[PDB]
Structure 1
Amino acid sequence: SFVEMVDNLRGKSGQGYYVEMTVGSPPQTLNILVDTGSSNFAVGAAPHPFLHRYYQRQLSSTYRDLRKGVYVPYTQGKWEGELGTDLVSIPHGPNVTVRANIAAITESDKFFINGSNWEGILGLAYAEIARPDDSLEPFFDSLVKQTHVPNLFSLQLCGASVGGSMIIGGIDHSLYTGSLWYTPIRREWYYEVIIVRVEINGQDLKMDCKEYNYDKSIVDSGTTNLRLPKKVFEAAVKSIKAASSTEKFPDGFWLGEQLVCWQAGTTPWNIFPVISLYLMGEVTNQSFRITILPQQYLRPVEDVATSQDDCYKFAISQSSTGTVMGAVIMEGFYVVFDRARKRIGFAVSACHVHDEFRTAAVEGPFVTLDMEDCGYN
């Protein structure tokens, strides 16, 4: 019955993917951003200039107050609100209703996005990073505990105004090609993984692999960019600059501050390298790789002035809290969050954006010694 969940995600480029949900009795319809980088379910519950609608607790006969405040800070944006519970369902999801924790957002800062079309957030990671503490059961944990929905979900994020699929409770084999390759979930808090090697156009970065996971490496559908630790970010930019040196860039480009343009249909894709991220595999000394095309990390932006050119922003940015494999990474793949088996699977997506001479790929097996030493402690 997973066909009913195909294409249940929508969004605007760079503003997150959202799924339709209902909260309360009678059901109140809201668009909810799907965020594997957090663990709180929260909805706008008060007027806001960027919200077209919001959760009205007074209108729901099943709302229960928890008499507890909550605050959640993200990499960018934060909100505070009032905790409670209510009945929740997903129209284009499993035919079930659960009572879940809901944070009613009463104040926020740089969280809601003007014209994004979403009014709340669905944190899909584990209780350990839920606020105020890990006793606030996350939505998916409630879903699994109260229903027969199996303990896994998959995300197919399709780039260029954006769409995709969140298959709740399973894997839809019509959505990917080739084989699924699995990497262990290192610890159940974020969806934390271990990167064991990085190559750019086939050349190893030759860094200590701990640098790739310095702090941690996570998979986050709610982050646009590929975010890399300082040292790794500098090495990658140096390599990408060198490969594309024949062209001129405002250099504010490499910081994401300025966009670059080219005459329509003349973008020199060939001069931007592919990036291969090798992930720890399921068996001893085995890994696999996922390869990213420049069409993934050069995010297209509509030039509001002379719509005569193809303009792009550099979607690789520096981090101080570890690697984040955001939408730039996920959009090329079908990603399985196999919570039951503590693993994350990657396969080439059926909605992969590919050029004419290169192809995004998930390839294995590879042999990699001492993968355990790549995790940071």
Structure 2
Amino acid sequence: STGSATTTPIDSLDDAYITPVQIGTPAQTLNLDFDTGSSDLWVFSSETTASEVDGQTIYTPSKSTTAKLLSGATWSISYGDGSSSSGDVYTDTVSVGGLTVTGQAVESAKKVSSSFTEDSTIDGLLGLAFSTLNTVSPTQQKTFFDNAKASLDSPVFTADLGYHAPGTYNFGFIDTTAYTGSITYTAVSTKQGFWEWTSTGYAVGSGTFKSTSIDGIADTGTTLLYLPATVVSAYWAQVSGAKSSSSVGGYVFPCSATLPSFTFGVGSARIVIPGDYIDFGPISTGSSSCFGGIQSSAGIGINIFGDVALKAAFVVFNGATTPTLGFASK
């Protein structure tokens, strides 16, 4: 079987992407943030503290004939940005673009952090990292992808994120019409539970390519590109007036500047991120200082190939017994 669903940016900056997901019987449609950096499917629900819900669509398990409370199961998650949520667990039917999984763990949020409440367009997250990161206790639960793997025509899903435009998540097949040239596959380490790979280097604008191993994760759930300080300093050195601001919390640049492209290596192939992709607009309404889409990972402890990088490519998440990552230009 296969599944195909359109994913849409939540705002004019591509801060996140939401994808409609059907939960329960009859279907309750929620717009979820597909996150290859985490492994929990959790949603706003009728159980969420009422003061912490502000415009989100909620899942109501009492209205689903297939919902089963997972007795004694709880969950609690903390993301690298300081966000957090927690609650209890149900099993229910979950469908993504025609692809159906029965008995999927649906984690009902009882408490969510403020940043989730303030995001009215995101009804929850759908984790697509490896199941070893799932936070359900005392019995760990499998991701949507892991549960669907056996019935998929091919044990893969692909991410085709758009720049200020809708995109597509596909399950079970590779759309050979969606990319140009060839797909370059690179090895994945699952030892931390992430889609972790090694980039072969980078280049700034039309500059010389620098062969150097950059170990990072493919994370659709992270907005920006987080790379080592040496690389990020080399990039912003090519933007007149750019500087790292402690009060803002990253590199900023004059909004009148034109940004150079950024290239990163995948084996012998190259993925070029257009400079316009790195512009994330004024730091505040009316400001002439703009926030950069490439930031340092020094404070994070791991390099993150977020949406800024991934939306420049057609990305294959190959969940075979030996998992790999595929990158193609588009």
- For residues 176 and 15 of structure 1, what CA distance do their matches in structure 2 show? 23
Q: 1:335 aligned to 2:312?
A: no
> Which of 261, 265, 271 is equivalent to 1:278?
265
Q: Secondary structure at the match of 2:43?
A: strand
Q: 1:237 to 1:125 in 2, by over 3 A?
A: closer
Residue segments in structure 2 that go unaligned for 5+ positions in a row: none
The equivalences for 1:207-218 within 5 A come to: 209=213, 212-213=214-215, 217-218=216-217
Q: 1:150 aligned to 2:154?
A: yes
Q: 1:159 aligned to 2:163?
A: yes
In the TM superposition, what whole-angstrom CA distance separates every residue of 1:305-327 from its partner, at most 9, and x where no partner exists?
A: 48xx8x74211222222110000
- For residues 277 and 186 of structure 2, what CA distance do their matches in structure 1 show? 21
Equivalent residues of 1:226, 1:329 under 8 A apart: yes
> Which of 83, 89, 98 is equivalent to 2:89?
83
Equivalent residues of 2:253, 2:292 under 8 A apart: yes
Q: Secondary structure at the match of 2:308?
A: helix
Q: 1:317 to 1:336 in 2, by over 3 A?
A: same
The equivalences for 1:355-366 within 5 A come to: none
Q: CA deviation at 1:195?
A: 2.2
Q: CA deviation at 1:116?
A: 4.8
Q: What code does the residue aligned with 2:155 have?
A: N
> Which of 232, 255, 264 is equivalent to 1:261?
255
Q: CA deviation at 1:303?
A: 6.8
Q: 1:140 to 1:71 in 2, by over 3 A?
A: same
The equivalences for 1:281-300 within 5 A come to: 281=267, 287-300=268-281
Match of 1:29 in 2: 29
* Structure with higher strand content: 2
Match of 1:5 in 2: 4
TM-score where L is the length of structure 1: 0.75
Match of 1:181 in 2: 184
Q: State the superposition RMSD in angstroms.
A: 2.8
Q: What code does the residue aligned with 2:255 have?
A: C
The structure with more radius of gyration? 1
Q: What code does the residue aligned with 2:80 have?
A: T
> Which of 162, 168, 171 is equivalent to 1:168?
171
Q: Secondary structure at the match of 1:136?
A: coil
Match of 1:190 in 2: 194
- For residues 113 and 14 of structure 1, what CA distance do their matches in structure 2 show? 19
Q: Secondary structure at the match of 2:177?
A: helix
Q: What code does the residue aligned with 2:146 have?
A: D
Q: Secondary structure at the match of 1:50?
A: coil
Q: 1:42 aligned to 2:42?
A: yes
Q: 1:172 to 1:204 in 2, by over 3 A?
A: closer
Q: Secondary structure at the match of 1:112?
A: helix
Q: 1:6 to 1:84 in 2, by over 3 A?
A: closer
> Which of 190, 198, 204 is equivalent to 1:200?
204
- For residues 248 and 173 of structure 1, what CA distance do their matches in structure 2 show? 42
- For residues 238 and 112 of structure 1, what CA distance do their matches in structure 2 show? 31
Q: 1:240 aligned to 2:244?
A: no
Q: What code does the residue aligned with 2:170 have?
A: I
- For residues 24 and 152 of structure 2, what CA distance do their matches in structure 1 show? 21
Q: CA deviation at 1:24?
A: 1.3
Q: CA deviation at 1:193?
A: 0.4
The equivalences for 1:219-230 within 5 A come to: 219-228=218-227
> Which of 294, 304, 310 is equivalent to 1:316?
294
Q: CA deviation at 1:70?
A: 0.8
Q: 1:79 to 1:257 in 2, by over 3 A?
A: farther
- For residues 151 and 59 of structure 1, what CA distance do their matches in structure 2 show? 32
Q: CA deviation at 1:172?
A: 1.2
Q: What code does the residue aligned with 1:82 have?
A: D
Q: Percent identity?
A: 24
The equivalences for 1:119-130 within 5 A come to: 119-130=123-134
Equivalent residues of 1:43, 1:103 under 8 A apart: yes
* Structure with higher helix content: 1
TM-score where L is the length of structure 2: 0.85
Residue segments in structure 1 that go unaligned for 5+ positions in a row: 282-286, 350-377
Match of 2:75 in 1: 70
Q: 1:317 to 1:142 in 2, by over 3 A?
A: same
